[PDB]
DNA sequence: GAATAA
DNA sequence: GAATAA
């Protein structure tokens, strides 16, 4: 007979404890920025022109 | 098959019968003492003075 | 608070 | 949607 004593012991079933490559981490990129919009200038991006948000 | 007859017999589980160092004995130190308090003297601890209990 | 906590 | 899907 194959028998033995132990604690937190069990007949051995399938164990592969590596995930099958499924895991998800979640960060939020957080980029608060104080900015200025200057239309008072003649230079490049400072003009009467609409300033763009390139989402 | 592994089997045998016996009395007060069991499949063998974990047995270490030494305690993990936890045991408590309790005595009371008992020290009744008849004593005298003498303030009638001039010598050392015999005076008008309060005699002390140094618990 | 089988490994001794009266 | 024992092999990680918060």
């Amino acid at each position: 007979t194959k028998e033995g004593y132990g604690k937190h012991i069990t007949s051995m079933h399938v164990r592969n404890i590596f995930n099958q490559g499924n895991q998800v981490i979640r960060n939020i990129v957080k980029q608060q920025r104080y900015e200025l919009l200057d239309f008072t200038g003649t230079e490049a991006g400072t003009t009467n022109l609409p300033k763009i948000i390139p989402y």
Side-chain angles (χ1 to χ4, degrees), chain A:
Chain A
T1 298
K2 180 178 70 66
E3 186 65 13
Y5 61 79
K7 298 166 59 177
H8 294 84
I9 182 175
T10 303
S11 64
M12 185 170 77
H13 295 88
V14 175
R15 181 173 175 87
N16 196 25
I17 53 94
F18 300 106
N19 60 352
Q20 281 181 359
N22 311 344
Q23 176 169 346
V24 59
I25 290 174
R26 54 180 179 182
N27 69 26
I28 304 111
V29 170
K30 294 175 174 179
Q31 196 74 270
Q32 288 218 317
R33 247 198 319 284
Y34 186 67
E35 286 176 346
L36 173 64
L37 277 59
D38 187 4
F39 301 150
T40 65
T42 60
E43 291 178 350
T46 60
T47 51
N48 192 31
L49 276 62
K51 292 173 172 287
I52 297 171
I53 300 166
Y55 63 92

